[PDB]
Amino acid sequence: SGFRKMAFPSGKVEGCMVQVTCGTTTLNGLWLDDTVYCPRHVICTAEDMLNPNYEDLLIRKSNHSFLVQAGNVQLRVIGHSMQNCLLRLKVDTSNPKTPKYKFVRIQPGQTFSVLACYNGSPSGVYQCAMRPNHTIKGSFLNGSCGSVGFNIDYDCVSFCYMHHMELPTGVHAGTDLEGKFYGPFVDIQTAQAAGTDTTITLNVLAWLYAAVINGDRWFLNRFTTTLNDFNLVAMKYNYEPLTQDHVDILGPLSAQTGIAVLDMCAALKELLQNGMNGRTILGSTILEDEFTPFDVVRQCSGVTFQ
Amino acid sequence: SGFRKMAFPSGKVEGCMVQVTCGTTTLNGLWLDDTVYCPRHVICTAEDMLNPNYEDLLIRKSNHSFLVQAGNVQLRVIGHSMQNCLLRLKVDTSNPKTPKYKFVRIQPGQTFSVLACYNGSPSGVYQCAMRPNHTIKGSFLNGSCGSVGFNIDYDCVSFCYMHHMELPTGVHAGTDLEGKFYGPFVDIQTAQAAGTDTTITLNVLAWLYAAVINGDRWFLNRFTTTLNDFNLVAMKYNYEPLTQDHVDILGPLSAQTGIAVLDMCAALKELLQNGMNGRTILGSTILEDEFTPFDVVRQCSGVTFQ
Numbered sequence: 319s320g321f322r323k324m325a326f327p328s329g330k331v332e333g334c335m336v337q338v339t340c341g342t343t344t345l346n347g348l349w350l351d352d353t354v355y356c357p358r359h360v361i362c363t364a365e366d367m368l369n370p371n372y373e374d375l376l377i378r379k380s381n382h383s384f385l386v387q388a389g390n391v392q393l394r395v396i397g398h399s400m401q402n403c404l405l406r407l408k409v410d411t412s413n414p415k416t417p418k419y420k421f422v423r424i425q426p427g428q429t430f431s432v433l434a435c436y437n438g439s440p441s442g443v444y445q446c447a448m449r450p451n452h453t454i455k456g457s458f459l460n461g462s463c464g465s466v467g468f469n470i471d472y473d474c475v476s477f478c479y480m481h482h483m484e485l486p487t488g489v490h491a492g493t494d495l496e497g498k499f500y501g502p503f504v505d506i507q508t509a510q511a512a513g514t515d516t517t518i519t520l521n522v523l524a525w526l527y528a529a530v531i532n533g534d535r536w537f538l539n540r541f542t543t544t545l546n547d548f549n550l551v552a553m554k555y556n557y558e559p560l561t562q563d564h565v566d567i568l569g570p571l572s573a574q575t576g577i578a579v580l581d582m583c584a585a586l587k588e589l590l591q592n593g594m595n596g597r598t599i600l601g602s603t604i605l606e607d608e609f610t611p612f613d614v615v616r617q618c619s620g621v622t623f624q
Numbered sequence: 625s626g627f628r629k630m631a632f633p634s635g636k637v638e639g640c641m642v643q644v645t646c647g648t649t650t651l652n653g654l655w656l657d658d659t660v661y662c663p664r665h666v667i668c669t670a671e672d673m674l675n676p677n678y679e680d681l682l683i684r685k686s687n688h689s690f691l692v693q694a695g696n697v698q699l700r701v702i703g704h705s706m707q708n709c710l711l712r713l714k715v716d717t718s719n720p721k722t723p724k725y726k727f728v729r730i731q732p733g734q735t736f737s738v739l740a741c742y743n744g745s746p747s748g749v750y751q752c753a754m755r756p757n758h759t760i761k762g763s764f765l766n767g768s769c770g771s772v773g774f775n776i777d778y779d780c781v782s783f784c785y786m787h788h789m790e791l792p793t794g795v796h797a798g799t800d801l802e803g804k805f806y807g808p809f810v811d812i813q814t815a816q817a818a819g820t821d822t823t824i825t826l827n828v829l830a831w832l833y834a835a836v837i838n839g840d841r842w843f844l845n846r847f848t849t850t851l852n853d854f855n856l857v858a859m860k861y862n863y864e865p866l867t868q869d870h871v872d873i874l875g876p877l878s879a880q881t882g883i884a885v886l887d888m889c890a891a892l893k894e895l896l897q898n899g900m901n902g903r904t905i906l907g908s909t910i911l912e913d914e915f916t917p918f919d920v921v922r923q924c925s926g927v928t929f930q
């Protein structure tokens with residue numbers, strides 16, 4: 319019992335973290351097999367990053383330019399290409415740690431685990447969600463670039479994020495491990511803003527189900543809604559419309575509580591229109607959206623305590 | 625920027641996690657050197673556990689009774705003994721992933737990372753606090769026994785907790801790695817309650833400092849307080865007495881933000897009295913007491929925004 323945002327255990331990813339230096343700039347890299355990936359902006363000076371031409375800047379650098387450290391040990395760089403925003407550095411040694419893995423591009427509303435690093439040295443692990451505006455509300459300082467986000471299924475790590483930058487709001491942006499940004503964001507030090515964000519409805523519902531399972535039933539009503547009419551309402555309040563797939567993903571929490579998905583939708587519609595005063599849910603005034611249907615199912619499982 | 629619950633990288637601990645079976649019971653063990661530690665209650669049948677004498681239960685058993693596995697591999701047990709709550713099973717192999725480690729008894733108010741496992745397999749890591757009433761608000765399911773709690777400094781893992789049971793209220797109880805329970809609990813399947821909990825005042829103040837460091841200030845005021853008039857308010861809201869030793873500890877954060885400890889108490893005293901007016905601090909609507917000063921310093925920048 320008990321509800322906690324959890325991170326996947328970070329050990330398999332820790333064995334791939336390395337340090338990468340080009341000039342006076344150091345940041346982290348991900349060493350899989352005989353390749354190290356890092357953000358390409360590592361090759362930029364303060365003047366370059368304003369308006370960089372990365373093919374131009376890359377053609378200047380040589381394998382030497384890059385110092386790659388795995389602990390104390392030095393790693394000869396024997397090659398360099400560039401994929402989108404990322405550098406692919408071939409190195410003289412193949413990482414004996416490297417885990418069964420894959421690169422997956424995460425979807426808005428999904429969660430993952432971030433291993434915050436500094437100077438190739440892991441500092442901590444935290445939970446996260448990809449926002450619908452394609453940023454994350456992470457925790458990162460200068461030096462964090464190249465830190466990665468991931469999920470583990472079985473023994474296989476699905477890498478989904480590499481950190482590149484902080485926006486002026488104080489949120490974070492980066493890429494998938496094929497270097498293609500989440501969002502409109504570019505790797506240039508220039509005013510860029512987070513777009514208007516949306517609440518993740520799927521996760522708010524899962525939370526309402528957690529709340530019911532977690533000893534609470536005050537929000538619930540007998541009012542009837544269609545998916546359509548719920549969705550019109552969700553949007554005027556900046557909630558994600560609920561898709562058909564979302565209805566399905568909530569199926570198990572519906573069976574467990576016997577509150578039909580649409581009825582929980584009618585619950586949430588009442589909360590958006592009327593507010594929730596002076597009432598709390600799971601001890602929170604506001605609605606939580608970064609806890610997933612999956613998280614709620616796992617933690618509750620498996621008996622009906624009642 | 626940002627602020628998050630944030631656990632230590634779990635890798636060093638993941639390489640010590642094993643499975644211990646006695647009869648039809650499976651739980652987790654901690655493998656250091658030649659030694660595996662798990663909860664002693666692994667011996668117990670259903671009848672035994674209501675009113676169990678553990679010295680007798682153990683005297684009947686042999687090294688053969690206990691199956692320990694590390695991954696696929698079997699580890700032969702060649703010794704066994706009871707230290708307090710936990711068994712020490714000696715095995716014919718020395719864990720080559722053994723990290724520099726030590727064993728510490730954690731003090732109410734401090735935090736640690738929990739590496740939740742099932743069948744010797746790590747599934748999640750999250751941060752917890754030892755509550756003043758000596759019970760942790762964790763997230764554990766059946767099978768999670770033997771999962772441990774820990775902090776890391778440099779190389780060294782300080783293990784502070786091993787999980788034994790969930791109380792009726794849904795909170796969790798366990799021991800240290802000497803096997804002495806935290807709190808008044810015993811290892812028998814009977815309902816046990818904890819004492820009345822208290823909010824950790826030192827931690828709330830560190831968390832308020834964290835908010836300010838991240839640029840959030842609405843709750844500050846020009847007021848100040850005496851320490852004593854502040855403590856007079858703590859007691860009303862069931863917060864813990866603040867002491868001068870506790871005040872000293874906030875000295876670094878006070879300097880960084882330029883907000884005197886006694887002024888932050890005024891801020892808090894106002895919050896407790898007037899509430900929040902549907903506002904949030906670091907995205908929470910409730911005053912957060914499971915971040916230590918150390919937790920704040922480690923994760924926040926050493927310079928303030930503005």
Ligand SMILES: O=C[C@H](Cc1cnc[nH]1)NC[C@@H]1C[C@H]2CCCC[C@@H]2CN1C(=O)c1ccc(Br)cc1
Binds near residue numbers: 462463484505506625
């Ligand atoms: O790890 C790097 C950080 C990550 C971070 C910091 N806080 C949260 N996350 N990001 C580096 C930033 C942004 C990046 C944007 C694209 C072009 C290159 C810049 C480069 N950065 C520097 O601040 C920057 C780098 C070098 C000089 Br000399 C002057 C300025």
Ligand SMILES: O=C[C@H](Cc1cnc[nH]1)NC[C@@H]1C[C@H]2CCCC[C@@H]2CN1C(=O)c1ccc(Br)cc1
Binds near residue numbers: 651
């Ligand atoms: O992993 C173990 C769990 C941990 C947990 C479960 N939910 C959250 N955390 N705790 C084991 C419990 C409590 C323990 C108390 C001391 C004596 C032995 C019991 C044994 N347990 C069983 O429920 C129990 C086990 C076997 C039989 Br057959 C009947 C009852």
